[PDB]
Amino acid sequence: PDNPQECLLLEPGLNEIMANSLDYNERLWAWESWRSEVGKQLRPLYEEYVVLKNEMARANHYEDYGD
Amino acid sequence: GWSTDWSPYADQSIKVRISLKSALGDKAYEWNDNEMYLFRSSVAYAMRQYFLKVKNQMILFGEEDVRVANLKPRISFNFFVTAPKNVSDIIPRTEVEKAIRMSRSRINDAFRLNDNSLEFLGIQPT
Amino acid sequence: TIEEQAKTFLDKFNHEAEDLFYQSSLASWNYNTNITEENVQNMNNAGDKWSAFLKEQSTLAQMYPLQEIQNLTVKLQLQALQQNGSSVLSEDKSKRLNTILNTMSTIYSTGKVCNPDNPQECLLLEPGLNEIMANSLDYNERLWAWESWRSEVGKQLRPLYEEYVVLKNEMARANHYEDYGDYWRGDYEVNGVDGYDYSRGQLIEDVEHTFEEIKPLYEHLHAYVRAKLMNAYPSYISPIGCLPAHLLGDMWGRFWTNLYSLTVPFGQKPNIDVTDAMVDQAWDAQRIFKEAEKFFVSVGLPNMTQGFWENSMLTDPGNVQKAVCHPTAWDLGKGDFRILMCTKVTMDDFLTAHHEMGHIQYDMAYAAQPFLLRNGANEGFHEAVGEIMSLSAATPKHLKSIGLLSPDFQEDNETEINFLLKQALTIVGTLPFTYMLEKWRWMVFKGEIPKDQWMKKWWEMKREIVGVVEPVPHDETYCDPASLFHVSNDYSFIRYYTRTLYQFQFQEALCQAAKHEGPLHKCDISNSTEAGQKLFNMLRLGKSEPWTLALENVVGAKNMNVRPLLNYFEPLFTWLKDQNKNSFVGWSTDWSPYADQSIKVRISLKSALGDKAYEWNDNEMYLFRSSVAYAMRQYFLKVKNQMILFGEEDVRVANLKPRISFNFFVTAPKNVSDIIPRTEVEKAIRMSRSRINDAFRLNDNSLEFLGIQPT
Amino acid sequence: INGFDLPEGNVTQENFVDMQQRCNASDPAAYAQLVFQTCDINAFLSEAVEGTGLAFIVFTEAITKMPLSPLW
């Protein structure tokens, strides 16, 4: 939030914070920011994914994708 | 064991009850997400005013800083305010209560409600 | 001694400086041709040592004043060392200012614009945003890149620039200067030289006067380009209005060169490209450099020093080691002249050879001057010299005689109009931009423009001087000027303006000596020894004498004159006026690309609220945009059954007045190009008009949505 | 106040005519298009009504701008 030029991905930057950083604020930032930036981008996709996946499994003679 | 009710944000959360039909009866608009969007915007407006007046601090509070929880068909919900770009920085309930008090009339006006219908639990008229 | 001890200090400094400087210059040259971490440290150490030496000498200079100094040479050198600069500011102030500078530069250099469709795709300016503003012709794409650039880096630079201006002004005032702008205008200012004395404010007067002289030619250029822009971008340019800033062929619209593609006077007529004949004659970077050398010798200017040929990067290293390819006329000093560039067998490279070697000619000419007097008369002198060299080489006659152009070649007047227009796009195009930017900065530094009116006056000046209109309204949160490199990296711009004038004055003067009988636009000063003499007179002079006197050395004048520039474009001018006979020539400072869907909204408080009427502030305005967003969301989710997440940011408010009147146009949540039509917006307004009134305790009479009629 | 976006209540009876010419000087092209009525109180008195109008046009109107209009 301070410097927009420094943007961490999950694999190394966010993971090292969540694994090492002992700062409530820093940890809260990483956690929340990950869900707020990437988690929203997956919401609509995941919804469609569920629908198509169920269809396929139902057509493969299954109650749902879980079954 | 654990209690599934404690939250890290419950402490500064203000409960809000909304009584449209109590103050409107007929022509009582349905509270939708748009009404909620308007509410978060109204709270942000108040926080800004309070800060710029009492603290002389031009803090750019947005509807996104207004974190709403436990939304119920009673139109009751719990909200807390955070810093404009700092999830960690939670605006203390005291300041938020003062901000509400200051602009309560304005908020009531925006929802055609009144202190009675717009129950800001913990804030009261005098 | 006093004058004698002052000279003694300067002499000692000059001797030591030359060697210490040599190290720094050589060290950098080595790295520039090597690009090795080892060489990084080498040049770094050399630079620190060299810089430290200069600092120490600056302190020594202070001891000896300039009043008792009578000899100009010693006086000038002393002034050039005595300059304290940011040292005058306190350590804390200097450090902060440095931090501001570093932050601004870092933001500009490393700022990224993510694509709205896919956030994972983010473009930096140099690689991506530049290839859009220069190549992409999509109105929406161009708008996106333009708006996003100012909506990200520019916003971040806003607070930095503000502090930067304060610290710079402090330093200038502490260095005995009116403002940081006055600090910059010191370059041309000349004192104690009778009949050559110049003033910082005089520079301003001269630039403004000369700008008025080029005004008409620019007007015709704008009118012609406007017509072409209208064809390239239908329903995006009004024939009587300004030009959308995102359609000027680059990010800031500094040059109109890219517009040449759509503004070509005669599409059928191409431009002379010897890049093929060169390859056919097995031309080489070395060949073109020798040709540049021969060009200078033809006008009497001396041949490149044999040593230069021995130590000059005149092509791509293309080996285990890499080198900077940027054309650079290196002057390591102590009689050391070099050129670093990855040049190829290209007509451009051929002309670049003449340009770079022209700088070397100037360097060699003033090489005999004192260490502190070895430089161009003013900031716009050295670059101008380089420009005329490339111009003379570019002349078809030069190419034809050198064999690059066929002797049988016939230069059609249409092809000549093509050439001239392309040049006007690069020259006449940048004159208003450069003038308006320096005017704005000068006013900002001297406090003419209050911080609350920075963006306001920026776009007013853009609409008036340059005839360019913002595709979207930008409040003081935006810092569009800072979004440019020179502003963000603390550089002067008036240099470019003055250089352009000087260049044409020089070329014309040399043409007069060359006895050229053709148009100045196609004047070839090659094979003109006498012209070389005039150029050389100022060349050898260096900084020993005033720039006004150096102008007399070649052009034979004191102040810059734009008449030669106008003369050069006179053929094009006649053609432009002919093409603009039917079209409107000018622009409306009132036309906006967003005015059509803009709804004017007057808020009346004393009429309705009267006593206990709330004051309309930014928070009141925040509430209003939020209220409009609410209405748009409701309208879409109900009438069109579309839950669109409209936000106050989509509410583009403009023309705010103390009457609480403003114009607003709703746009798409994440698409600046998608602006919601006034009709649909009016429907949303009417649907929630009651609720909006409630939010401000106002009514239809007090809350006037002009055009939205209450019933 | 509209044609010149003046702050509401900046212009009053105390400062109309001086702000007419002032604003005229500021922007005459954007002042000429403004249309002003000859608001003179004296004329409003010499404005006699013909016929039965004193009861059905003058009194009946004035009554509507007096609280207890129905009683009046």
Ligand SMILES: *[C@@H]1O[C@H](CO)[C@@H](O[C@@H]2O[C@H](CO)[C@@H](O)[C@H](O)[C@H]2NC(C)=O)[C@H](O)[C@H]1NC(C)=O
């Ligand atoms: C995989 O594909 C085959 C091919 O159609 C499916 O077999 C059919 O299944 C349906 C439903 O039992 C029958 O009505 C068809 O007559 C079958 N056709 C053939 C050619 O076998 C099979 O069911 C598919 N697998 C699943 C699990 O759905």
Ligand SMILES: *[C@@H]1O[C@H](CO)[C@@H](O[C@@H]2O[C@H](CO)[C@@H](O)[C@H](O)[C@H]2NC(C)=O)[C@H](O)[C@H]1NC(C)=O
């Ligand atoms: C972001 O929010 C956190 C949580 O409020 C801040 O951390 C505290 O900030 C206050 C005021 O700066 C200090 O008095 C506390 O000592 C801080 N320590 C804690 C909670 O970690 C943090 O400073 C804020 N950072 C930014 C960027 O605004």
Ligand SMILES: *[C@@H]1O[C@H](CO)[C@@H](O[C@@H]2O[C@H](CO)[C@@H](O)[C@H](O)[C@H]2NC(C)=O)[C@H](O)[C@H]1NC(C)=O
């Ligand atoms: C200013 O100083 C320069 C520097 O010495 C003087 O130039 C010299 O003039 C004398 C007399 O002709 C020569 O013998 C020296 O060789 C010159 N030296 C250099 C390095 O230029 C110049 O004459 C002085 N002029 C004034 C105004 O005092």
Ligand SMILES: *[C@@H]1O[C@H](CO)[C@@H](O[C@@H]2O[C@H](CO)[C@@H](O)[C@H](O)[C@H]2NC(C)=O)[C@H](O)[C@H]1NC(C)=O
């Ligand atoms: C740069 O620094 C020098 C060094 O102090 C300044 O020269 C002094 O100026 C003051 C004011 O006239 C005198 O009282 C001192 O005696 C001077 N000292 C010396 C040794 O030069 C000079 O004015 C400063 N210039 C700028 C650009 O601020």
Ligand SMILES: *[C@@H]1O[C@H](CO)[C@@H](O[C@@H]2O[C@H](CO)[C@@H](O)[C@H](O)[C@H]2NC(C)=O)[C@H](O)[C@H]1NC(C)=O
């Ligand atoms: C400048 O003058 C030189 C001197 O003649 C020109 O060089 C010649 O060019 C012609 C055309 O190719 C040749 O036929 C001659 O043999 C060349 N002579 C020499 C001695 O170089 C040069 O072309 C002239 N440049 C211009 C622009 O006119």
Ligand SMILES: *[C@@H]1O[C@H](CO)[C@@H](O[C@@H]2O[C@H](CO)[C@@H](O)[C@H](O)[C@H]2NC(C)=O)[C@H](O)[C@H]1NC(C)=O
């Ligand atoms: C280049 O010169 C020719 C010669 O005049 C121009 O051709 C003329 O164009 C005008 C405009 O269409 C006609 O009215 C004339 O009758 C033409 N004359 C001849 C003899 O061709 C041509 O337009 C010019 N091209 C440029 C640079 O504009």
Ligand SMILES: *[C@@H]1O[C@H](CO)[C@@H](O[C@@H]2O[C@H](CO)[C@@H](O)[C@H](O)[C@H]2NC(C)=O)[C@H](O)[C@H]1NC(C)=O
């Ligand atoms: C964003 O909005 C703009 C304008 O609504 C869209 O651009 C238009 O696209 C249509 C279809 O190709 C064209 O016919 C119009 O001429 C375009 N308008 C302009 C001003 O050029 C654009 O496609 C939308 N893009 C996104 C990101 O949704």
Ligand SMILES: CCNC(=O)CCc1cccc(Br)c1
């Ligand atoms: C109905 C016809 N009468 C009039 O128009 C005027 C009468 C009238 C008006 C005011 C006071 C008195 Br006393 C009488």
